[PDB]
Every structure is written in structure tokens, then in C-alpha cells.
């Protein structure tokens, strides 16, 4: 069933929001339920095995509870704060920041471990194999993609290309919007042609001086699970504040083909989870909306309460992290 | 060497750095351009948040890599 709430341990709803998103990440959940992590676990003492163990036990407990049971993640929390001491307290925290440290911990514990002559695509493939020989896990299987960044000197026309892995994308929010800001508007702002001039002129290795350049991202490899993090932060050099702009994101048929380096039939996503923040930058409350992998129905997970919801209630301006799965 | 930071609203900035530069040094460099206190900055690369006390080399960060600048929505 998977409709168990998580006990608030003291400002830990950021952690619970993320835990529920991951609980409803079908392939990650199955990994834990089917106990497939056991043979992936590393041996050797104080290689943080308890983190994977306590995370998997929590996912197991959630998916074997009666609906409206409340589960305690206290053992898990002990393990995550040992892995990442910033989470030692009972202070309010950022859910994205928590996601990154959590997935890093899990990944590390089940880890199974110049090119100017090459065309772009071959260079990327080689950089990708080079990466996968350092970072190769079931967690990576799900979350990791590859960006291509192309930097062109406007003077000599030389284009330097590099390839950066990613486990999520942090998207700037469009200030525009005809009727509404959309997720596609945000992906466009991420992948757009960035002008690097004035103070931002890069040095051109061919021109041997600072030149106006254009820099552009595309997606070279799409991940199975695409996590999109909306940059809800103002540019204030005094008091930073939250951007509460409504971003309209789809539930279904997010086709990211246009952002690909190479045309692909396999960059279409469906939404399955959302981590919501209500508050300011300094404080607030987290909730999660998640689609059960089994039934396809949505629930709100809020301060240990688990309640059904319609798909029409899923899109809100409080959306902060969006979890999409390759359809 | 030069690396890039994708900042908060759509723009990218260019930093001059050495492999031995500490994450704190990078944050200072970003402060000089963006006016964001280092203690508020989080820098993501290849799914890792870069930690103070470590260096660019520690993370295999090469020329023309891009760092993703994000701040925080604290919640409980
Ligand atoms: S406090 C809490 N508990 C659960 N299960 N889910 C959440 N989502 C956001 N906050 C929470
Ligand atoms: Cl052991
Ligand atoms: Cl605010
Ligand atoms: Cl910007
Ligand atoms: Cl330094
Ligand atoms: Cl940080
Ligand atoms: Na030991
Ligand atoms: Na480049
Ligand atoms: Na700011
Ligand atoms: Na990495
Ligand atoms: Na680049
Ligand atoms: Zn040039």
C-alpha cells in the first residue's frame, strides 16, 4: 500500500518530504523491497553501511504498513547525520540539499567500483565511460545524466565542448509568462545561449586573449529519473527572498527532445512526485505529493498525515522539487 | 583555468581559478561578482554539493566545467 506517514522528529518535514518522494520512486523502492542492495553493500567496518540499511528498512516499513500508520525515521536520521553532520541538529533545512547528501551517501555505499580529434558525440561517450568507471551504482542507474556544454569564441569561431554528469537540474525561473510561467520556459532559460562578455569574458585558447563567448547547455544523456529543482531565490545582496512564482509543470508527457544533443524517442517523462515548500527562505513547512507506483493514485504526505488528492490539486506555486520518470 | 557558474536567474558568470583553489575561495570569488555571502551559497557539480575545506582538484573539476549555484528554502 505505501500510505504510511513519517513522524516529525523536530523540524524534519524536509527529510520526510524527500523520503516519501524516494519511497514512491518505483525502481528505488523495489531495490529496497526485493532486498537487492544486500549483495551490493560494501564490506569493511565504518564504510557507512547502516545508512543504506536504515534507509531500506524505512522504505520496507512504509510499504508494509496499514494506511495512516505513522513510521519513525529516528534510526535513519542517526545514520544520515553521521554521514552528513550538517543534519545533526533539529533545525529547519533545505530538501534539495538533503536529497543531494542522501543520494551521495546511498550511492557511495553500493558503488560497484586531449579529445580534439573526436566528434562531439564520441567525446561525450568516452567521458561517460570514464565517469561510470568511477561511479557505478543502482542509485546512479536511476538519477545520473550527462550535460554537454558548448562554448564558442565569437571572434575565431572555435567551439570548446565539455561533458558534465548531473544527478538533478537546478532551473532558473522565468520572470515572464504570457498567461503563466511554464516548466518548459524554465528549461529554456537553463539551456539558453548565455553571453559571456564584459567582466565575464572567457580567455580563448586560440585567440590567446579574453573574448566574447557564447555558452550553451544541451542534454547528452537523459536519466531514468529526472529531478528538477526550481531556483526559488531572489538576487538580493542584502536580504535574499523566496520567489513564489507559479510554475506550471505537466503531470504527463514532458517531452524534452528539443533539449537533447541528438534527436531521441526516449526523453518523455511523467511526473510521480513533488516536494513542496511553504514559507520564506528562513523558515517554513515541507509537504510531498506522490503517485503510488502500484495504483497510479496521488496522495498528500503532510506532518504524518497521508490523504488522497486529485491530480488537479498537484500543481501549486509551492512546488520546489519535481520528480519525473522516463515514460 | 576558467570555470563557470550558472547563477540564480538565467545568467552564467566566469571564474578564474586554480585546481588548488578551496571551495571557500570559489565562494569568495562568487561573492565578489554576485554579492551572495559564502555561507548562503551551495554549489552543485556532478550531483555533489561542494564542501568547504576541499579543493576543486578534490572533485576532479576541470576547465570549463559549470557549477550550479543554489541557495536554501529552509523548512521543518
Ligand atoms: S512531516 C512529514 N511526514 C510525511 N510523511 N511526509 C511529509 N512530507 C512533507 N512533510 C512530511
Ligand atoms: Cl562491517
Ligand atoms: Cl522570503
Ligand atoms: Cl542569473
Ligand atoms: Cl583557496
Ligand atoms: Cl555549502
Ligand atoms: Na572501525
Ligand atoms: Na566548453
Ligand atoms: Na541573493
Ligand atoms: Na559525482
Ligand atoms: Na563550458
Ligand atoms: Zn577565439
Author numbering:
A (entry chain A): 264 to 376, 386 to 599
B (entry chain B): 1 to 76
Give the original sentences from the paper that presented this experimental model:
Although repeated attempts at crystallization of USP2 in complex with 6TG failed, we finally succeeded in the crystallization of the USP2 in complex with Ub and then soaked the crystals in the presence of 6TG. The crystal structure of the USP2-Ub-6TG complex was determined at 1.8 Å resolution. Fortunately, some residual electron density like 6TG molecule lied on one side of the catalytic triad of USP2, while Ub is located on the opposite side. Nevertheless, the structure indicates that 6TG has polar interactions with residues Leu269, Gln283 and Tyr558 and van der Waals contacts with nearby residues Asn279 and Phe573, while may also show a possible covalent bonding interaction between the sulfur atom of 6TG and the thiol group of residue Cys276. Unlike 6TG, 6MP lacks an amide group. This may explain the ineffectiveness of 6MP against USP2, as there is a hydrogen-bonding interaction between the amide of 6TG and the side-chain oxygen atom of the residue Gln283. Interestingly, binding of 6TG leads to movement of the β17–β18 loop (residues 574–577), resulting in a 3.2 Å shift of the residue Asp575 toward His557. The binding of 6TG also leads to the movement of Asp575, an absolutely conserved residue playing an essential role in catalysis. Finally, the irreversible inhibition of the enzyme by the inhibitor and the slow-binding inhibition via affinity labeling suggested a possible covalent bonding interaction between 6TG and the residue Cys276 of USP2.
The human genome encodes about 80–90 DUBs, of which the largest of the five DUB families is the ubiquitin-specific proteases (USPs). All of these studies suggest that the inhibition of USP2 may be a good therapeutic approach against cancers. In the present study, 6-thioguanine (6TG), an old drug still clinically used to treat leukemia, rheumatoid arthritis and bowel disease, was identified as a potent USP2 inhibitor. Further studies using enzyme kinetics and X-ray crystallography to delineate its direct binding to USP2 were performed.
